[PDB]
Every structure is written in structure tokens, then in C-alpha cells.
Paper text:
ECF transporters consist of two identical or highly similar cytoplasmic ATPases, EcfA and EcfA′, and two transmembrane subunits, EcfT and the S-component. The membrane-embedded S-component serves as both the substrate-binding and the substrate-translocation domain. The other three subunits (EcfA, EcfA′ and EcfT) together form the ECF module that energizes substrate transport by the S-component. Here we report crystal structures of the group II ECF transporter for folate from Lactobacillus delbrueckii (L. delbrueckii) in the apo-state and in complex with the slowly hydrolysable ATP analogue AMP–PNP.
In addition, we present a structure of solitary FolT from the same organism in the folate-bound state. We determined the crystal structure of folate-bound FolT1 at 3.0 Å resolution. Well-defined non-protein electron density inside the α-helical core was assigned to the folate molecule. The occluded folate-binding site is lined by all six membrane α-helices and is located close to the extracellular side of the membrane (orientation as in Fig. 1a), where it is shielded from the exterior by the L1 loop connecting helices 1 and 2, and the L3 loop between helices 3 and 4. The substrate-binding pocket has a volume of about 1,400 Å3, which leaves a vast amount of space for extensions on the folate molecule such as a polyglutamate tail. The pterin moiety of the folate molecule forms a network of strong interactions with residues from helices 3 and 4, and the connecting loop L3, while the aminobenzoate and glutamate moieties interact with residues from helices 5 and 6, and loop L1. A detailed description of the interactions is provided in the supplement, but it is important to note that loop L1 and loop L3 provide many of the interactions with the folate molecule. In FolT1, L1 and L3 cover the folate-binding pocket and provide multiple interactions with the substrate, whereas they have moved away in the substrate-free state, creating a wide opening. The conformations of loops L1 and L3 in folate-bound FolT1 are incompatible with binding to the ECF module, because they would clash with TMH3 of the membrane domain of EcfT at the position of the conserved P71. Thus, high-affinity binding of folate to FolT and interaction of EcfT with FolT are mutually exclusive.
Numbering used by the authors: 13 to 167
The structure:
């Protein structure tokens, strides 16, 4: 199939942009979301969950993660690309979908899950973790939404 040539390239994209990030073994800030949104826009949730799940393995395998591989961050990258799917897939680019999608991702994946992982990886209690990370998760969503627009428009 043609679209599977595509899937690879966008995994490749997702992996590459993912390497533009600043941060800690606790919160990181980067362009990885850009790729993961593409996966949900173009391929839908299932293939988007697959591609996200996948692109994390690859990115891990090549670049490696601070503090080592954790199978949790994998799940996150899969849900991340799958939620942008349920929202944005085969639909007219709208602002309310962009807000809803980035808001759900940020709550479940970033605020919920990645904190759960970080809390686990470090010795912390969850809210200790949450307190270190919550400023980012309040600020970035608007940047994510704007970027998500230009991405969705551009393609
Ligand atoms: N398999 C695997 N994949 C990974 O990416 C990974 N990353 C780490 C490094 N730990 C972290 C901790 C927090 C964030 C983080 O806070 N990311 C943002 C999303 C990225 C963004 O929004 O720019 C977040 O808010 O959770 C990333 C990596 C450790 N093990 C891993 N293991």
C-alpha cells in the first residue's frame, strides 16, 4: 500500500522533531507533539496509536531516554497520537476540535500519565510530581493549539 510509505516517513518525522526538546528527567518541552498530531490527523486513532507506540520504540532505540526506557512513556505516545485521532481525523479543520483535542491530551497524557510515570521513576508522591510540572501544562496548551492549527491548515 502507498500509505505505508507515508506512515514510516511521519514516524520518521515524529522521531526527528521529537529530538528538539529542552528539559529534565522530569518535564520536557518539545516539538514531538507536532508529529504525534500528524499521526492522528492523517492515519486515524488505531494506526495513530500504532505509529505513536512505534515511533517511541524507534526514538528510544536510536536516541535513548533520560534515565532509561520506561514502557509507560510508550503508552503515552500511543494515546497522545490516538486522541488527536478521535478528534481531528477526517473532519473539517475547526478551532473547537483543536481546543478540545489539545485539552484532552494535556489532561490525560501529560498531566495524568506522564506525571504518573515521572512520579514513579523518581521516588516522589504523585502530587509532588504534579507540582513541579503543572506550570508547563497550563502554559503550553495554547502554543500547542496554535501550532496545531498551522499544522492542520498547512497540510
Ligand atoms: N520509552 C520511553 N520514552 C520516553 O520518551 C522516555 N522519556 C523519559 C524522560 N522523562 C520524561 C519526563 C517528562 C517528559 C515531559 O514532561 N514531556 C511533556 C510532553 C512533551 C511536551 O509537552 O513538550 C509532558 O508535559 O509530559 C518527557 C520525558 C524517560 N523514559 C522514557 N522512556
Amino acid at each position: 500500500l502507498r500509505e505505508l510509505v507515508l506512515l514510516a516517513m511521519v514516524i520518521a518525522i515524529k522521531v526527528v522533531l521529537g529530538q528538539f526538546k529542552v528539559g529534565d528527567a522530569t518535564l520536557q518541552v518539545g516539538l514531538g507533539f507536532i508529529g504525534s498530531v500528524m499521526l492522528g490527523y492523517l492515519f486515524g486513532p488505531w494506526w495513530g496509536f500504532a505509529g505513536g507506540a512505534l515511533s517511541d520504540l524507534v526514538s528510544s532505540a536510536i536516541f535513548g531516554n533520560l534515565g532509561g526506557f520506561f514502557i509507560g512513556f510508550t503508552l503515552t505516545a500511543a494515546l497522545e497520537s490516538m486522541i488527536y485521532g478521535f478528534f481531528l481525523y477526517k473532519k473539517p479543520i475547526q478551532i473547537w476540535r483543536v481546543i478540545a483535542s489539545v485539552i484532552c491530551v494535556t489532561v490525560i497524557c501529560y498531566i495524568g500519565l506522564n506525571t504518573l510515570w515521572v512520579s514513579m521513576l523518581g521516588g516522589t508522591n504523585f502530587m509532588v510530581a504534579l507540582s513541579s510540572r503543572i506550570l508547563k501544562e497550563m502554559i503550553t496548551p495554547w502554543i500547542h493549539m496554535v501550532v496545531v492549527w498551522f499544522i492542520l491548515e498547512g497540510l
